[PDB]
Structure formats: C-alpha cells, structure tokens
Amino acid sequence: AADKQTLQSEQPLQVARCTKIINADSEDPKYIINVKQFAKFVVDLSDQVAPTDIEEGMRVGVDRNKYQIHIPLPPKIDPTVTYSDVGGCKEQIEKLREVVETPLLHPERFVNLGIEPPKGVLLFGPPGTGKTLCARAVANRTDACFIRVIGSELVQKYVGEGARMVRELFEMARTKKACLIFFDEIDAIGGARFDDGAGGDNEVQRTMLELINQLDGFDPRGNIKVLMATNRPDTLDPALMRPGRLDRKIEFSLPDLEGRTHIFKIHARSMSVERDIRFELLARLCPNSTGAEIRSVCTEAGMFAIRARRKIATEKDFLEAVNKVIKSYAKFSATPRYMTYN
C-alpha cells in the first residue's frame, strides 16, 4: 500500500482509448479513426490538445463518450527495427569510389562542369557476392559510420509505422556526418504501384512515397550515402529512376578465378591454417561458387581441423573441404563414380 491512497484518487481521472489514426480532412483537424475491430469514424478533437501532432500513422487518446482526441505519443515504438581487404570485385570499388567519394571530396569536377553530383547507386548482383563488404568498405574513409537495414524489418502491422521508421532513419541521418545506411530487399519496400480495387498492402505504398520524399527532393542529402541492393532493376519506380538520383548501376556477378583466390587469401588469413599451402587448385575446384561458400569451405576445412587436432591446415584439409561441399554436400555424394573421362 505504498501509494494506495492516491490510487483511491485516480478513480475520477481516467480517459484515452487507443484508436489508431487513418487520415484527416483538409482546412481543419477533422481526423479519421478506426478503433480496433468495430468500424471506422471521422473524428474531431478535444480542445486542450495540439492539432499539429495528430498526424497520420499514430494512435491518439480518445474519450469513451465523445471519442474526442486526447494526447498521443508514439504508442508503437522501439522493437520495430532489427577494412583491410578493400578489394573484392575490382571494377566496382572504383565506380563506388566515383559515386561516393567524388561528391564527398570535391564539388570541383561536378558543379564547374555543369553536372549534378551522383548521389545514389543501384547495386545488382547475386546474393553472397559481397554487397555487404563493399557497402561497409566505403566506411573506412568517410569517418567510421555505418548502419545496416534489411527491407523486411519494416514489415510491421500498423499504418505508416514503416513510414515512421523512415522518419527515424532520415532524422538520424542528419544528426551525423558522412554516414551510411544500407538498403536491401527493396522489392517488398516497393517499386511498382500495383493496384486494383482491394486496399491491401498500402503501408508499403505510403512508406515508399515517404521514401521518395525524404530521399531526394526537399532538402537533399549532403554527407549521407545509402546503397540499395537487389537482383533486379526491374521492379523499381521511375520516380527514383528520375535520372539524377540512382544513375550508376554498378555491375558484378560471380567472381572470375582470381577473385576466388583473393577470397581464399581473406578467409585463410583470418583463421588457423598453415602458411605453406596453395589455393589455385581449390580455385579450379570452384567453377561456380560464392565467397560466402568460400567461408563455408574454410569453416569446413576448420571442421576437418577439429576432427583431427589441426591448427595448421594442410592442403588436404581444404581438399576434403571442397570435396565435402561441392561434390559430397552439393546434394549427397553420387554425381561422380564413373571414369569415361580420365
């Protein structure tokens, strides 16, 4: 009973049903609310509130008897959002150097020649290829800053909540200088305006409009660069294909052979192997593979290096690792077992 008497004084002070906001009229507050389950409503406010902060994508206090608007806050928040080896793909970091580094170093080549600074890139390539590494490998030279954002993190079940996190990311971006948010799975974020008379997946729609608004147009970017990752330039918008926003389209695909030797260097140096072995034979054994699968190969040679007590990996450890992954774990073991060839 540490506060029991005051609890017998709050019984005449009780208000404010949850009631998320759909939208409003114009010229006036005149908002529109669904409660949860019943119906819809075209509401108006109580007088002692701020009609400013009753904006769309919010859940306000609402009276029982008059449904008049009381004080909001964001009642849906915080759990909502989950480089020495610079040199992976080759022709890519140089175009990365261009579109990122050259506006962030000099407005000398750009404004004087009469062009606008290229500010955004459409990365495209298969997954497991190092979009994350090149993205973060930008952040050695800027200052140190990076944030990572998967697209389907914004799949949360309230209207404009993803747009609210667009608000959050763009008002964290301008707090800091020379920073890097990263984008990925930008198809579910939306590039195509699919519509018929259904009214469904619309938080994506208004969040994507919020994305076009805060991205480019109405106080542009400055010392903020954001890469967008995909397998397709096919499911995007012609409003960010507005030709001065995302105009480079850096290309890469599976590495050649020597790229895989470089990734062999990378995931050989960062673990316990022996420094007397080669990798080009293993590079021949990987005609189509990813550096993520090179990580799997190196961790599997580490699994053999667990099997026997090995901290100095032989060539045979990586031999049986590749033999494990590409021929004895590609599906089972028995695509070989015939000569006809040798």
Binding site: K4, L7, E10, Q11, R17, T82, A292, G302, K311
Partner: protein
C-alpha cells in the same frame, strides 16, 4: 499492522478482475492495457505490486470497470512447460551401435564437441552451428537420435513437438514462443529439440482463426525470436522433419540454420543387424532366413523392421506359438506394407 495495508490493497482491487496483453513501457507508472479484444484506457498500476518483474508486453491482472493494472500474472502452467522442460535424462543413447554410424559421428562432433568443449573455436576462430535440420524418410531414427543426445548429454535438454504451438486463441502461440524461449534461455547451456515442423506448413484447422494469418504470425515470432537478436551465444537448438517442401526458405538460409543433414535408409549390411536386434529379445525357430526380408523391401525404414519383427511374433503368439514360422513372416510383412510390390520390377536384371 500489515493486515490493514493488505486489506486496503485487496480493496483497491474490485473482485471481478481481468487479464490483458500489453505492448510497451509507459515509464511513469500510468499504463494502457489491451485486452484480448484491446480496449485501452490510460490505466494505472496498483503500486505495491512489482511492475519491474516483467519485460515489456506481457499479461498482468486487470480490472473490468476502470481497467487498471492490479497484480502480476500467475506463472501460468500451460501444458507445454511440463513437456518442454525435459524432466529426466531419460534412456536410449545407444543400446545397439550399427544403425547409422555416419551422422552419429557428425551429430557428435557438431553438437557435443563444440558445446561440451567450447575451447576449439579459441584456436581456429570458427562459429558454432546454431541450427541443424536432421531429416529424411519417416521411421529412420531422428526422434531416436534426438533422445540419444538427450540422455548422452551434459546440457539441459529440451524437447518440443511442432503441434504444441497450435492453439485457437489470439496471440496464444506467440506467447508460447515467448515462454518457450524463456525456457530455452533460463536453464543452462541447453539442447533444444524441435520436431514436426513440416506438419505446420500446408496445415489449416477448424479450432482456428484466419488460417494463413495465424501461424504466419506464430512462425514469424519464431523467426524474430530464434535466430534474430537476443544474442545467440551457446544455445543448442535442433529441428527435425521428414519432408522439406512446406519449409519457408527464410528459415532455411544461413545465419539461422547452418548444416543440412539427411539420413539414408540403410544398406543390407546394417539391415542384418537391425533385423537381428529387433529380433534379439524373442523366441524364434532359427531355421528361417531373414535375408529374404532383408533383401526384399528396397526402401525400408526401421519402423518397417520394428513392425515386421514384432508382428511376426504377434502372428505366431496369436495362436500361442513361441517360435515363428516363415509364412508368419509372410503374413507380417504383407500386413505391414500395403501391396509389397518390389518384385519384377525387378526381379529381372537378373
């Protein structure tokens, strides 16, 4: 005395009391309560109960008329925790070596040896396997090997059936995921086992809400809880199925589940031992040759061998005969398999 303070707390309460699911801290002790159906006034809390026992968004004791928070919820003994929290380390590690021997070694040096000696990753900078899907044909040993690692252990084993998470209430299953991973968090280094999550994908019910919009949310809570944040560290979780078609690949991808392990239906060289050991504890007229049964069924599981080696003795002891005739093995196997059709084709290699 204490009696009057307790009576005044009891009369802060109004005897029809209720229960509602929350979302979020409202730090200055006034709160707001969804119900099941979610009608949410700016409520208080009866300030002698501990508000800070609990993390955000969980059931408490409420009122019906002013909706205010009253007490902490009871640690509600759902039928899961008695099954989820594995009571004893039961039995059956290996009564009989010679059933698999391929992925016994694999499950050993992938589940025991990283966990029970977590000092090899010190030398070689390797991450442990978090999830491994053990799968294959039905009746192989997946549940058996799960119990085998469940007894042969030093970690607090946990055992979960995939239909334990399927209840008709709203948000019930996600709460069961929450308490499930509380159980998975708050024992020890632990070996969670999950079974039958291929019986969850093309599955709809009548004791149910909107079907594709019910366990999408539950398995999405599983997604956001299992290998999301809330740092992984050392928590062993094993999931097992028979088929792989109904699996969302969002959970099959790395980060969440590393190793993919099938199980072959065994060769005849180990069928002789499995048929022998399933027949090891009965009386049998030893003239009969199991090599007929061993060579015959081309894709036998061990439940096949189980039902054969027991049902032949059942057909013999049906008429009270201790030892089994070979045509009782005929009757047994032709009961066990519906239309024992492995002869030509083929049959006529030959």
């Amino acid at each position: 005395k204490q009696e009057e303070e307790r009576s005044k707390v009891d009369d802060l309460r109004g005897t029809p009391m209720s229960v509602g699911t929350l979302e979020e801290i409202i730090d200055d002790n006034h709160a707001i309560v969804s119900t099941s159906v979610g009608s949410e006034h700016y409520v208080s809390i009866l300030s002698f109960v501990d508000k800070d026992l609990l993390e955000p968004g969980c059931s408490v004791l409420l009122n019906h008329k002013v909706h205010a928070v009253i007490g902490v919820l009871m640690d509600d003994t759902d039928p899961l925790v008695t099954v989820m929290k594995v009571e004893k380390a039961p039995q059956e590690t290996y009564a009989d070596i010679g059933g698999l021997d391929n992925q016994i070694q694999e499950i050993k040096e992938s589940v025991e040896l990283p966990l029970t000696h977590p000092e090899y990753y010190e030398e070689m900078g390797i991450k442990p396997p978090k999830g491994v899907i053990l799968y294959g044909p039905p009746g192989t040993g997946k549940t058996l090997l799960a119990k085998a690692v469940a007894n042969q252990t030093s970690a607090t084993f946990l055992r979960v059936v995939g239909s334990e998470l399927i209840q008709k209430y709203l948000g019930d299953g996600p709460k069961l995921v929450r308490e499930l991973f509380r159980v998975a968090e708050e024992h020890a280094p632990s070996i969670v086992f999950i079974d039958e999550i291929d019986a969850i994908g093309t599955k709809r019910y009548d004791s149910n809400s909107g079907g594709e919009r019910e366990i999408q949310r539950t398995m999405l809570e599983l997604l956001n809880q299992l290998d999301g944040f809330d740092s992984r560290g050392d928590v062993k979780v094993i999931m097992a199925t028979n088929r792989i078609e109904t699996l969302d690949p969002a959970l099959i991808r790395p980060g969440r589940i590393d190793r993919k392990i099938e199980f072959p239906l065994p060769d005849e060289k180990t069928k002789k031992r499995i048929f022998q050991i399933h027949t090891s504890r009965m009386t049998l007229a030893d003239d009969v040759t199991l090599d007929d049964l061993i060579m015959a069924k081309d894709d036998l599981s061990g439940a096949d061998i189980k039902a054969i080696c027991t049902e032949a003795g059942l057909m013999a002891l049906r008429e009270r005969r201790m030892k089994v005739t070979n045509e009782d093995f005929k009757k047994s196997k032709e009961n066990v398999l519906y239309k024992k059709q492995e002869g030509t084709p083929e049959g006529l290699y030959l």
